[PDB]
Design a binder for this molecule. Structure first.
Ligand SMILES: [Zn+2]
Length: 214
């Protein structure tokens, strides 16, 4: 794994510097919501909408496992399958998702990645489309989740409490980003967080974040 080379205060700084409203929240005040990660839960997208998921308690990352492929510059189906098997071996059920309105293009993160919206940040675009990616994840043993309804996120949670997560609430929506999970998968954490912040921004999400720490 890789370590957390950026402090919560710096994260807050960075965000406010991109025009965000941000602050640090102590895990003890969210005691009732922070859930110990359940290994049978799918590692899924930050998306705040309801879905047909029945595998709760997994880590939250942009586009599900796509965040990992994205951060590492992995752009092929074979590489994506390797990541799917890697995730499953490291304690989480790998997933990606789509929705009813746009099918497999229903994951805003992937659509941004596929459409070159990360070009400016120097990211190699995927070399496959949303349909091919979803099917490759499934074929490699992962899950394809399906959301519904519209995006109504009121805030962004950047959870830095390792081994814990927050769950979606379709009636009082929020984006959830498990930053510690990036360390677990040895990702460039700073890059992972900037990418997550950018995703909210480009999707016109709320630029209000709460950084959760022990
Ligand atoms: Zn998504």
């Amino acid at each position: 794994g890789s370590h957390m080379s950026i402090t919560p205060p710096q994260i807050v700084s960075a965000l406010r510097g991109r025009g965000w409203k941000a602050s640090i929240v102590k895990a003890s005040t969210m005691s009732s919501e922070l859930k110990r990660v359940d290994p049978q839960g799918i590692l899924k997208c930050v998306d705040g909408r309801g879905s047909d998921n029945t595998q709760f308690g997994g880590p939250k990352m942009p586009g599900g496992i796509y965040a990992i492929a994205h951060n590492r510059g992995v752009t092929t189906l074979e590489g994506l399958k390797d990541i799917t098997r890697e995730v499953a071996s490291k304690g989480h059920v790998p997933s990606v998702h789509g929705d009813h309105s746009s099918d497999m293009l229903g994951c805003g993160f992937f659509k941004l990645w596929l459409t070159g919206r990360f070009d400016d940040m120097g990211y190699p675009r995927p070399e496959f489309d949303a349909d091919q990616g979803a099917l490759a994840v499934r074929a490699a043993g992962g899950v394809i989740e399906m959301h519904h309804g519209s995006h109504e996120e009121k805030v962004v949670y950047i959870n830095l409490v390792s081994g814990m997560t927050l769950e979606p609430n379709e009636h009082d929506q929020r984006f959830i980003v498990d930053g510690w999970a990036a360390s677990k998968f040895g990702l460039d954490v700073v890059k992972f967080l900037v990418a997550a912040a950018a995703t909210v921004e480009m999707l016109g999400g709320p630029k209000k974040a709460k950084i959760v720490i022990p």
